[PDB]
Design a protein around this ligand. Structure first.
Ligand SMILES: [Cu+2]
Length: 125
């Protein structure tokens, strides 16, 4: 099985996929985020954030209120399973999480905290 994925966020404010699969055998899963654009992070920086679909809007609301100083996430928000740092063009970051953290029967999503329009699903198979 494969227990990691490579994902890109670019200068046009989009990720290069809207769907990640996590094999049910994985105990840990790694997301390798890169930014193959030319814009730096103070213009078009991206991160990658994981929550349930049901929690996404609340995470974004509280992140918005927390602001740029906190990379648009409430610090220590228990609804956020994992997240990367904010990266600009040519930079990269990876995050690894325990697959045991996914609540059984719940659909998960990923998104960019800076650009909540950038989103997708993360699913067990
Ligand atoms: Cu973004």
């Amino acid at each position: 099985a494969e227990c990691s994925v490579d994902i890109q966020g670019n200068d046009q404010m989009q990720f290069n996929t809207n769907a990640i699969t996590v094999d049910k055998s994985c105990k840990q899963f790694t997301v390798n985020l890169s930014h193959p654009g030319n814009l730096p992070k103070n213009v078009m920086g991206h991160n990658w954030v994981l929550s349930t679909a049901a929690d996404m809007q609340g995470v974004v609301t509280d992140g918005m209120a927390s602001g740029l100083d906190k990379d648009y996430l409430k610090p220590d928000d228990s609804r956020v399973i994992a997240h990367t740092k904010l990266i600009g063009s040519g930079e990269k970051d990876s995050v690894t999480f325990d697959v045991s953290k996914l609540k059984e029967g719940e659909q998960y999503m990923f998104f960019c905290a800076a650009h909540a329009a950038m989103k997708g699903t993360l699913t067990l198979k």
